[PDB]
Amino acid sequence: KFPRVKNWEVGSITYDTLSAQAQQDGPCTPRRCLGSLVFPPEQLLSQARDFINQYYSSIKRSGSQAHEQRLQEVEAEVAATGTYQLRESELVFGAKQAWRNAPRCVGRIQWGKLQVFDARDCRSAQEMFTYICNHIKYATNRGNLRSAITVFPQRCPGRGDFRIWNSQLVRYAGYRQQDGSVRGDPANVEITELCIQHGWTPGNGRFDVLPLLLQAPDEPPELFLLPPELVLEVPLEHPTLEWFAALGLRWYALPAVSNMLLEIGGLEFPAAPFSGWYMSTEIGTRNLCDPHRYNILEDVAVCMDLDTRTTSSLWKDKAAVEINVAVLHSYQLAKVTIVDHHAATASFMKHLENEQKARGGCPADWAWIVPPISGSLTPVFHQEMVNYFLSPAFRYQPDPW
Amino acid sequence: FPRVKNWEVGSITYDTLSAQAQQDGPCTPRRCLGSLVFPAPEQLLSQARDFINQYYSSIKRSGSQAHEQRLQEVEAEVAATGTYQLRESELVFGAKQAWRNAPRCVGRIQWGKLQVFDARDCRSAQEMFTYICNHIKYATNRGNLRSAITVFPQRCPGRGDFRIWNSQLVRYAGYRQQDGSVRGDPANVEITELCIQHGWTPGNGRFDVLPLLLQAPDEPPELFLLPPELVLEVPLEHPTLEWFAALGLRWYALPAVSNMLLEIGGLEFPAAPFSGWYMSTEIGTRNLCDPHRYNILEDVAVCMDLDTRTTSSLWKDKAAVEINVAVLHSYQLAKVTIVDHHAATASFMKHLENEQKARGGCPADWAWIVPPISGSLTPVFHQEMVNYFLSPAFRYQPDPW
Ligand code: HEM
Ligand code: HEM
Ligand SMILES: CNCc1cc(F)cc(-c2cc(C)cc(N)n2)c1
Ligand SMILES: CNCc1cc(F)cc(-c2cc(C)cc(N)n2)c1
Ligand SMILES: C[C@H](O)[C@H](O)[C@H]1CNc2nc(N)[nH]c(=O)c2N1
Ligand SMILES: C[C@H](O)[C@H](O)[C@H]1CNc2nc(N)[nH]c(=O)c2N1
Ligand SMILES: [Cl-]
Ligand SMILES: [Cl-]
Ligand SMILES: [Gd+3]
Ligand SMILES: [Gd+3]
Ligand SMILES: [Zn+2]
């Protein structure tokens, strides 16, 4: 009844007893597996209890005076108001736990080092922008990146919500042409048209930092031009392919996701942007080489004079590796925090053993932990994993349009 | 009906074939176990009833004379003997469906072109050896490889099973060492011990072809040396790194899997070895670079003058790419069929399109289909997949020891 889980590189075996606690049913059934699909009223009370119980057991304080009392005041809070507010330390506990529970995040060896900015006393877009701009600058820290989340007011019935309209705080533009095809990032063509709608003027670049679209409850969104000095960027150069710089590639320093809904102990925070630091394959492999993203693979290969006329020359593999080298090298020369997939995955194996000893397992989504180049060269490839939903959690949510 | 998206292009289909999935796999809504490597007359009737129904849809004779006759026959044969016998064309179809249905096979574009050798009259291990030698000879075809399966007598009440104890027809020995290490392939230490225990004289090279351990019903397994000239091998060299030839590396031409069970209509064929041709990544990445296999990565990288002291130089990825290049070039030098992971994944995308029109879906195991290097450089990375079990099928079975 406890999944047997093997490591094929060493032969070791563990049991994931933590999977017993899974709550939100996944998409898989004994009949078919859907593990590769990307996006597959007083219920509040039961979610509330077991979160508080988590908090106190986490601090060796279960069955103790403050535990009894905190259970009453939440029960009393919901009685009158039909909802409740979190104690600051609890919001700190939920934020770090929701990170710890993220099955697809390969960087959770860092889950206990998280700076939480409480932004619950907020109203109007001009306020968020200041909260956002304090996060970004705190998080960037002149390239010495530091993990941070900012949590905006929770969801209330009978009132709009706080939402950021960009998938991330930093996004590059996506412009069509007299032939449809995109100049700039084709990922963000939909939000580029929403911004140009809301006043912004299109640049002509492949790396134009998009303006934020911030939306306060029931008031229509507001454009915001981010300060240029607050958007740290790293021009991409290769250590030994002098022509690489002339290709003119850049990526921003801060991966800061602003469209996921933080759920802690029953409450759902639709605006809660978190950030950390990049893994190099995220930029060098997915963002620049995906056929529907920047899709630079062929252009780098021509410049390295590789034979693009036969797929068996592995020219794709050769140029991809070098695009990744140029990312790691450009970020290191810029002194911005970045991690390569070999270092990241090995630390995740450490994280798994940490979590086995502490909690009897760890939800992990194999197809997202394994890197998108050189998979079987990393030890996560040879590690069987179990995937499920623990709470508190980061969740996806509808786009606010 | 599971909705499946291709993310590179944007397409959406619905896998309706999955609603027919028979035997249940490892996952529940509580937890996905997709990444695990290893997940009464009345029911032999329902299984065979379904297979016969399949065979007759395929010949466009669904609901006819022969169709009800064959059903009436099979229920008469089960009542009288407890089993029944496949007709030869039924056996050819069942074996081609089994390949088609195999979710972890990327080579299934070719499922219709399969040469089925009927050895269900085999009477001993010695005769079993002769069918196998013939199989290897036909399939090797002097390097112009052909896809083949030999089918030995089915499991039956009263007598034991035919078994090939070897996991493949062609395997390299793995001898343990004085310092605990292994010379040869460490995946084959166990079978190697058995061959010696059964009177084989071991060598001491790294690429020693193992003998065959063949088990007739209620017999000890019998040893058989494969004739040297029957096993085509390929010395490994690199197009440009001329020191590579000095590693002394070889692989064999024919991938011939011999430890799986073929199930057709509830009948079980515990010995039915099958073979096609290699994808270069199985050899270059897994067999040669896995830390628990030949583990040549570090030794290639030193020789390449790569910086092996930091992982951020991506020495592993660079060395592994040249190992794959070497495999492809060597097999083309020797005029031995081989397919690289870009061509193989591109033809698999075609298979999913063929199969969506023909059957409304295709059972696919994402983590096995995506190559172990260059994952997102291939179109299958960006394609969501539905994994499930269809019959006829190749199944795993315990080792007979
Ligand atoms: C500090 C360094 C970090 C690294 C290197 C890292 C790495 C990654 C990577 C590579 C992914 C895959 C995303 C994709 O490919 O689309 C991911 C997903 C995720 N990360 Fe982390 N991360 C870090 C910090 C954080 C922090 C601070 C949080 C929140 C507090 C977080 C929460 C998440 C979540 C919820 C996901 C899943 C989102 C999704 O499934 O789309 N990560 N992470
Ligand atoms: C003709 C070219 C073929 C190619 C390129 C190919 C490719 C592959 C690859 C790369 C794998 C994963 C192997 C591994 O990771 O160890 C695989 C698995 C498999 N192949 Fe194919 N194959 C071919 C022919 C065949 C044939 C002729 C059959 C049977 C008639 C077959 C049946 C299977 C099965 C049953 C599996 C999965 C076994 C398992 O689950 O471990 N293949 N194939
Ligand atoms: C909205 N999808 C979630 C997402 C998408 C994505 F492309 C990247 C990341 C991500 C986040 C953090 C904190 C670090 C990191 N290295 N990556 C998260
Ligand atoms: C029981 N393990 C199944 C297995 C293991 C394995 F290592 C390799 C292959 C395989 C088989 C064929 C016909 C072609 C090919 N290229 N690979 C199959
Ligand atoms: C369909 C497939 O599951 C999809 O492309 C996934 C695979 N694994 C991934 N892993 C990460 N980290 N990010 C992704 O976007 C994806 N895409
Ligand atoms: C545990 C992990 O699932 C295991 O190493 C798998 C991963 N995917 C694989 N995929 C293929 N095609 N072949 C394999 O041998 C493996 N090994
Ligand atoms: Cl990103
Ligand atoms: Cl093999
Ligand atoms: Gd020139
Ligand atoms: Gd030279
Ligand atoms: Zn699953």
Tell me, what CATH number does B61's domain have?
A: 3.90.340.10
Asked if A325 reaches chain B (Cβ–Cβ under 8 Å), the answer is yes
Q: What amino acid is encoded at B341 in this protein? A: H
Select the residue from A101, A304, A314, A382 to test the B interface by mutation, using most B Cβ atoms within 10 A. Answer: A314
Resolution of the experimentally solved model in angstroms: 2.0
Ligand 2 atom with the shortest distance to the CA of B148: 27
The DSSP letter of residue A291 is: T
The experimental method, as deposited, was X-ray
Give contacts of A293 with chain B, Cβ < 8 Å.
Answer: none
* CA nearest to B170, candidates B193, B187, B154: B187
For CA atoms A51, A54, A59, A64, give the dihedral sign.
positive
Give contacts of A1 with chain B, Cβ < 8 Å.
Answer: none
Q: Do B31 and A366 touch (CB under 8 A)?
A: no
Rounded distance from Cα B359 to ligand 2 centre (Å): 21
Which chain A residue is nearest to residue B280, measuring alpha carbons?
Answer: A312
| B180 and B126 assigned to the same domain | yes
* Counted domains in chain B: 3
CB nearest to A33's CB, from B32, B325, B375: B32
Q: Strands A115-118 and A148-151: what pairing? A: parallel
For CA atoms A131, A137, A140, A145, give the dihedral sign.
negative
Q: What 3-state DSSP class applies to A267?
A: strand
Measured distance CA(B126)–CA(B147) in Å, rounded: 24
Q: Do B377 and A25 touch (CB under 8 A)?
A: no
Compute the nearest-CA separation of B326 from chain A (Å).
10
Measured distance CA(A345)–CA(A329) in Å, rounded: 19
DSSP H or E segment with residue A56: helix A44-58
Range of the domain at B189: 121-146+161-232+396-400
Task: Please indicate, yes or no, if residue A376 is contained in any of the structural domains.
Answer: no
CB atoms within 10 A of CB B137: 15
Task: Please indicate, yes or no, if residue B3 is contained in any of the structural domains.
Answer: no
Task: Please indicate, yes or no, if residue B377 is contained in any of the structural domains.
Answer: no
CATH assignment of the domain containing B224: 3.90.440.10
Q: What are the C-alpha distances in Å from B297 to residues A72, B291, B320, B326, B340? A: 60, 8, 7, 13, 19
Residues whose CB is less than 8 angstroms from the CB of residue A280 and which lie 6 or more positions away in sequence, other chains included = A324, A327, A328, A331, A338, A339, A340, A341
| A286 and A365 assigned to the same domain | no
What torsion, rounded to 10 degrees, do the Cα atoms B71, B75, B77, B78 define? Answer: 140
| A247 and A336 assigned to the same domain | yes
Q: What amino acid is encoded at A281 in this protein? A: T
| B315 and B211 assigned to the same domain | no
Task: Please indicate, yes or no, if residue B351 is contained in any of the structural domains.
Answer: yes
With a 6 A CB cut-off, is A372 part of the ligand 3 pocket? no
| A180 and A294 assigned to the same domain | no
Rounded distance from Cα B247 to ligand 8 centre (Å): 19
CB nearest to A343's CB, from B34, B285, B311: B311
Q: Strands A261-264 and A393-395: what pairing? A: antiparallel
What ligand has the least distance to the C-alpha of B30?
11
What ligand has the least distance to the C-alpha of B305?
10
Question: Which residue's structure tokens are 């252009």?
Answer: A299
Contact B217, B270 (CB under 8 A): no
| B49 and B174 assigned to the same domain | no
For chain B, give the secondary structure using H, E and C: CCEEEECCCCCEEECCHHHHCCCCCCCCCCCECCCCCCCCHHHHHHHHHHHHHHHHHHCCCCCCHHHHHHHHHHHHHHHHHCCCCCCHHHHHHHHHHHHHCCCCCCCHHHCCCCEEEECCCCCCHHHHHHHHHHHHHHHHHHHCCCCEEEECCCCCCCCCCCEECCCECCCECEEECCCCCEEECHHHHHHHHHHHHCCCCCCCCCCCECCEEEECCCCCCEEECCCHHHCCEEECCCCCCHHHHHHCCEEECCCEECCCEEEECCEEECCCCEECCCEHHHHHHHHHHCCCCCCCHHHHHHHCCCCCCCCCCCHHHHHHHHHHHHHHHHHHHCCCCCECHHHHHHHHHHHHHHHHHHHCCCECCHHHHCCCCCHHHCCCCCECCEECCCCCEEECCCCCC
| A337 and A350 assigned to the same domain | no
| A139 and A205 assigned to the same domain | yes
| A226 and A251 assigned to the same domain | no
Measured distance CA(A7)–CA(A302) in Å, rounded: 40
Task: Please indicate, yes or no, if residue A70 is contained in any of the structural domains.
Answer: yes
Joined tokens for residue A393 = 């959690």
CATH assignment of the domain containing A314: 3.90.1230.10
The DSSP letter of residue A347 is: H
Task: Please indicate, yes or no, if residue B383 is contained in any of the structural domains.
Answer: no
Measured distance CA(B324)–CA(B373) in Å, rounded: 10
Contact A100, A108 (CB under 8 A): yes
Measured distance CA(A150)–CA(B353) in Å, rounded: 45
Task: Please indicate, yes or no, if residue B205 is contained in any of the structural domains.
Answer: yes
Give contacts of A340 with chain B, Cβ < 8 Å.
Answer: 311-312, 314
| A304 and A239 assigned to the same domain | yes
| A288 and A354 assigned to the same domain | no
Measured distance CA(B147)–CA(B337) in Å, rounded: 11
Task: Please indicate, yes or no, if residue A381 is contained in any of the structural domains.
Answer: no
Which chain A residue is nearest to residue B295, measuring alpha carbons?
Answer: A377
With a 6 A CB cut-off, is B210 part of the ligand 2 pocket? no
Give the CA count within 13 Å in the CB-facing half-sphere of A97: 20
